Amino acid sequence: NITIFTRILDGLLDGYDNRLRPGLGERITQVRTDMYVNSFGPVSDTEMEYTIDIFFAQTWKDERLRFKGPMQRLPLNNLLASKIWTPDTFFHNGKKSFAHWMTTPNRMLRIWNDGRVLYTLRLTISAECPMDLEDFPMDEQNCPLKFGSYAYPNSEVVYVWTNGSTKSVVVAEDGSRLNQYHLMGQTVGTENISTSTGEYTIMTAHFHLKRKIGYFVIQTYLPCIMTVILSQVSFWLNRESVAARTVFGVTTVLTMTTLSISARNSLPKVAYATAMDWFIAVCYAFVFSALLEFAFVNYITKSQPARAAKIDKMSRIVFPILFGTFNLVYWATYLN
Amino acid sequence: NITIFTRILDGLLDGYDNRLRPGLGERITQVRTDMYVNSFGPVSDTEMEYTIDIFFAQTWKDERLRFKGPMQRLPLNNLLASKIWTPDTFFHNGKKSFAHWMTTPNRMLRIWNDGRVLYTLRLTISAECPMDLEDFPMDEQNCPLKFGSYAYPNSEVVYVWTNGSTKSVVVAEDGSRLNQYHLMGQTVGTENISTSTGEYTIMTAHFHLKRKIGYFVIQTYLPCIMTVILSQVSFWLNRESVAARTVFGVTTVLTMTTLSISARNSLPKVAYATAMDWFIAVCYAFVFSALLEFAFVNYITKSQPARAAKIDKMSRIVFPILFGTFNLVYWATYLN
Amino acid sequence: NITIFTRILDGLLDGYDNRLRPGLGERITQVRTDMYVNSFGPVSDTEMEYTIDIFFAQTWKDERLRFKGPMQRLPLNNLLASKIWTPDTFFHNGKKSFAHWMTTPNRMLRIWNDGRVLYTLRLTISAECPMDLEDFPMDEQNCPLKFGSYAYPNSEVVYVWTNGSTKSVVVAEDGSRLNQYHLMGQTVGTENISTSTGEYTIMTAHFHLKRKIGYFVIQTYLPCIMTVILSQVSFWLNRESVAARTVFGVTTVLTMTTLSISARNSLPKVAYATAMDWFIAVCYAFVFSALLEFAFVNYITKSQPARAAKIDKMSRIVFPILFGTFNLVYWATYLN
Amino acid sequence: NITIFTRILDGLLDGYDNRLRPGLGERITQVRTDMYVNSFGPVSDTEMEYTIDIFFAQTWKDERLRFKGPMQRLPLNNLLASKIWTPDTFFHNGKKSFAHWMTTPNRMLRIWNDGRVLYTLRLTISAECPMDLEDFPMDEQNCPLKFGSYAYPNSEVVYVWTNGSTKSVVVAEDGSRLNQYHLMGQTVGTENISTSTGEYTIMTAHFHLKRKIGYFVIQTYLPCIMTVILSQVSFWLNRESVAARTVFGVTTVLTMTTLSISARNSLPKVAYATAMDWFIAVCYAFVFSALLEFAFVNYITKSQPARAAKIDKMSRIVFPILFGTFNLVYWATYLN
Amino acid sequence: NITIFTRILDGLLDGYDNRLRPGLGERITQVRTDMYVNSFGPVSDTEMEYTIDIFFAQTWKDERLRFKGPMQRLPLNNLLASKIWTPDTFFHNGKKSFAHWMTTPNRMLRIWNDGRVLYTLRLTISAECPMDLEDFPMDEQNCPLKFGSYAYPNSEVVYVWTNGSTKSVVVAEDGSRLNQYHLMGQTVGTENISTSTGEYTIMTAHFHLKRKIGYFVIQTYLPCIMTVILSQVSFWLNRESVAARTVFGVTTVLTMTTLSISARNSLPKVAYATAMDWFIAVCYAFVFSALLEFAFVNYITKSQPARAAKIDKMSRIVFPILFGTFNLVYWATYLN
Numbered sequence A, B, C, D, E: 001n002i003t004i005f006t007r008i009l010d011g012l013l014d015g016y017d018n019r020l021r022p023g024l025g026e027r028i029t030q031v032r033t034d035m036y037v038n039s040f041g042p043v044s045d046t047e048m049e050y051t052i053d054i055f056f057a058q059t060w061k062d063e064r065l066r067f068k069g070p071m072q073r074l075p076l077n078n079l080l081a082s083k084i085w086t087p088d089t090f091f092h093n094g095k096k097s098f099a100h101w102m103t104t105p106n107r108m109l110r111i112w113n114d115g116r117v118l119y120t121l122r123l124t125i126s127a128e129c130p131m132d133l134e135d136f137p138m139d140e141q142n143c144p145l146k147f148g149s150y151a152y153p154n155s156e157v158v159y160v161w162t163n164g165s166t167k168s169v170v171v172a173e174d175g176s177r178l179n180q181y182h183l184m185g186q187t188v189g190t191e192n193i194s195t196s197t198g199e200y201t202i203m204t205a206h207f208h209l210k211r212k213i214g215y216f217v218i219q220t221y222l223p224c225i226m227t228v229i230l231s232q233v234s235f236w237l238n239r240e241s242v243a244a245r246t247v248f249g250v251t252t253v254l255t256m257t258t259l260s261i262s263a264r265n266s267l268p269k270v271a272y273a274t275a276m277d278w279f280i281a282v283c284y285a286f287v288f289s290a291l292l293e294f295a296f297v298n299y300i301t302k303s304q305p306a307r308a309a310k311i312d313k314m315s316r317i318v319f320p321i322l323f324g325t326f327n328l329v330y331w332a333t334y335l336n
Ligand SMILES: CCc1c(C(=O)OC)ncc2[nH]c3cc(OC)c(OC)cc3c12
Pocket: A092, A147, A148, A149, A150, A151, A193, A195, A196, A197, A200, A201, A202, C034, C035, C036, C055, C056, C057, C108, C120, C121
């Protein structure tokens, strides 16, 4: 009852060459690709890379594997994977991709009577996801995933997604778990590119990422906000207390300076200003401006004390209002 | 006396195909899995990963390997492991799993007369353990371990634990040694999942982790507690000592700010507030509030000195009581 | 219709030795090399290394592979790559080069009737790019890429670029994306080197890198510039305020000291002064000089107060002018 | 003269099965293990791991390899290593072990006429060495090294050290070079463990490590000791100098706080107090106590100045004596 | 014309055993080793390791490979490398050595009529170079490179350098490029070592390294030198300015303390004092001594003001002279 299967496998491999694609010189091989995301790994920001584990699956028609028998399907494993022809799919943006070999090489091969072949592989891709951090941290990132044939041009092998976008890409409920991102959705697309070696079809899958705020608020914004409030306390101290008010201005300014350096340590070394950078710069101006006001007041406190008192009293009201007004514009501008 | 064993091995391999599972088209293959944990490696927090070394073992029945001879068992090694059929078990949450090949590939194969097969493999799994750090550091983590067949659906290969939970999973006495965790216990479970490729049984093992406190107390809590006490010292200084009391308020506030940044450097970049974060925030309020009290007292020390003295004297008693009362509620709330 | 291809492949491999180069003892093998840069990876500064992913391609003539058939080309994959002779090309500056094996080893083999062979391979090279950081960050780097045969001297195998430089090297539009560099252009060259094992031709490709400024301005220059301005504020304070002006001088000097240490943390540990280092040193002099002026003024404020006031008033004007004048010379000198 | 050796090798491999241990079903295989330590790699503290390179050697008797010829020994290399049976030795505590393959796989095989076999392998073991840092840095660590058979129980394969302990383990003169440890000596032992798969003999080698002090003295103790002395300087300042003495107390307390955090950055995140931690805590009390004394003195300097002067004068003598006395007890307690 | 070469190769491999060294039982195999350094990689200080890329070459005589033909040499590649016998050379100090496999395994095999064989291999060695940092950074390091046979004792295989030292080791002009070292020269040597497995010849190559100063001057010495000068500024301030002079003493002392910790972060954790450590300690004494002088002066400024003024005036001259004198002795002592 089991010996029948062995004979069928031997017959298919008899006279079968794995170096030639099915339907060579008679038609164009068609491949259907479906992807299942086991887990969307962490999205490293500094290196512009993200790790993803998927069960990449490919389906194609091969008449050379047609067979007749009591069983309509032939489940198998990696043993027969190398004995037949398979597409030379590769990932363009994958900087370093490795497979899983334990406990057994994670590969499956299913063959039907008509000759249809299903081949699925488990992969871990450390792809590169360039990001435009103009609105960081209020930025949305669209990490793509490009793959295609390495040796067969568009005239020989063509990749097409199966059914709609929802069925083409599937993400596990627990797979989409990122500490500082939200997986809003996924999309797919196809395109052709002309090269010196010929035209090759490109299959691209895009993941919509919505960065979640809250870590930077507790890390960068709140220390800056409290620091600005600390500087304004000097406005409530007497002018003659030159030493006391000096500490607030000097300490606050230096505190903001180190926060900017510390804040960008995790941020990628991008050569442009981000939204957070402007917020820090504005906060730096307030603390720096407060010190200038104290110096100006202390400079004229002897010649015209009357105006000095008025400026100090006014500063107690103007500064808090401007800082509060700026926050509403800043948060509203990006949070909308 | 030794040549008899060689003939038996040759006979079993004669006409045996490793590409077909035992009992194909006649029944459903049943596999019994037992696990022994050599050492529960460190549980990295930042990357949500933990390393575990186990002696994964699988048992199944194969009638094709039945034999008769003086010896009731056939101890072997990895040499014959690849010559026969083995399940394509894999770990779903294993981000990167590698085997041990030195001195020899750590694999054993034992066969009995009835045809029962025992196959054990040594593995090192860098699995992912998502954690909800809402009660951190007073949090309990349940790291799972999911594995199953890659090519054989539930209708062909089924995994079941052997005997009770205690025998299914065994942990070495010295294996469970973590610097900041306690291995309270282990549990196992089984479930079915429906996918496009069919239904596959899932075997999950859960490890109960109870984080041990003491490192964060010496690292985060104690510096914060002493810092708050330092600020309250200013209440015992004369009001006219404006400069002296200014240093305490400014220095203490900045000290708390850097502690919050330093504390979360090791903590994962989670976008929500933890229990420790609230404690730091409350401590920040006390030191910040003390500075406000000094500023308010110094503002009215000229118009109504009588009330200024009363506020300063009262602050010496109210502040220590509130800080002490808060600790009892905080520690009692989580330590219970 | 497909069986014809199988016979052709068998005939070519019949009597073909892959250990002997084509045209041995009759002529000199000629190889044409064309490169396509999929993505120019990050250029690490500390380790003097850069990562590049390219589709390295080689073309050569082999009369032993001549064939006649209906199809003028024979697209193939890695299966036949090892069955024939290929050049032993290697990268001299490549510290650690690894290939991509997923989903399939990225290799293509195309053969024409005349016997011309096209062989392309995907590689990731962690080459070393020594840099002379004399004008850093206003420095231009020319990272080379040297490769050649390992066993065949110039008298047997010769590498030559195909057509012009533009066609020889091609860079993808999205491939050239660096956080702190601009890919101005590419150039190629050839040379011979004499060694104990014979003369070997060297193929070198140079990439022109123009570092983009803006990250260091927000990281190093701006904190230094503001720090210098902070020190000059002390010139507007009264001389008798010894304590108040002391804080500015001491704090500013220490702030510059830590910036220099922090600035070079990312910079490679080079044993020479860079352009940025001189800017920091000059800024350090201004803040340090301001403290000296205060000390000198405070030393003679009792004997000859008249001159002390004049020096303090003059310092308020001289110092800002010199710092501003220095910036124009510094920026103009390098930004030109 | 050389052809004789070839015939002998062919004869031994004729009818020899490498899947069966020598003396199967007739006796118990005995293996003698001798180890040579090429270099005891660094002992990482944070990860509780140490790297060691050894020339692991195993000797056993195999009657199937008996031969007669002019030469009494048959030096060989890795080529014949896989053609015969070898023990499946593995390291229990080895988290990740890799071999050396350059220039050639470092393996030797020597066979004598009687059939004795010598098999040595070079290995690099990243074993785990749990440490109890109760007396750190005055702590002695005993890193073990456990290995044994993976498939052959104690009833089939037994490991025994050769001759005495000195000959069993040999360490190169230059191999034992650690930056913060001393290799006092080595010891060996054997034991049996009962498991579900049977009883397996365990071979354990223990290395005696005596941590060398001097790095922490220049890194942690000395900064703390000088900081405490700095605080005591305030006792020599006038009481009315409230601001001057405030800086010493505040700055010293914060300096100790950062030292404790910095000190434990390299130390493993252990959830218990070490000997160094107590020393830091005691030093923190002295600096903190000095600030309290100043605050208490300044609080009563108006009502009863007479007692205030006495306390300040007494503090100048009591504090240095207590700090010096504590050091003698602390150093003597552990350095003995 | 090409078929002649194929026959010659087949004849040599006919009856040739790669498991037996040439001239076995008739003489002692002699191997000549020549090394070419493609690039001397970075010399990591913390891990006591350095990376080097070399074209290791070995030459030996094999009569079994004698042939007669029109061509006097047989250039080849890695294909035939494994088909013949090669020495089992290995590196003793190599902690982790890996080869280069792209584009092709970098191996060459050349055979002459007399039977001489040339075999060269490209290797990347992460060898260990212990360093005695007693005179750091004015220290000279001699990193060795030990290699030899793994299975053939001195009585069978002997390694000898070819010609003089200059020809034995060759370093590329651009290869010797280190950020903090100078490759003064190279030397070679041979020695015998007796072991339990027999006597094995050892080939050692030593590289003379002269650390280049300038990075530490801008990183450690200059901040310390300026800090000491900053402390001496307090000597020019009035005694009554207790608060002003307190800041200089406290801030400078703490600044030196953090520099010592920061300086040794890159330095290896060696348990002994280096030359730089003494310089920092001396600088610490000057700043600390200045604070003591101020405290002593302020203590007696009321009882005997006359002596207090003299001490302060004298300190302005003595301190700068001693610091300058110390530098001349320190720099001259090591820079000579
Ligand atoms: C142009 C690079 C290249 C080369 C080569 O070496 O060219 C010099 N050889 C074969 C190739 N197959 C490709 C398939 C592709 O799309 C799926 C593709 O898209 C980026 C590029 C190539 C490709």
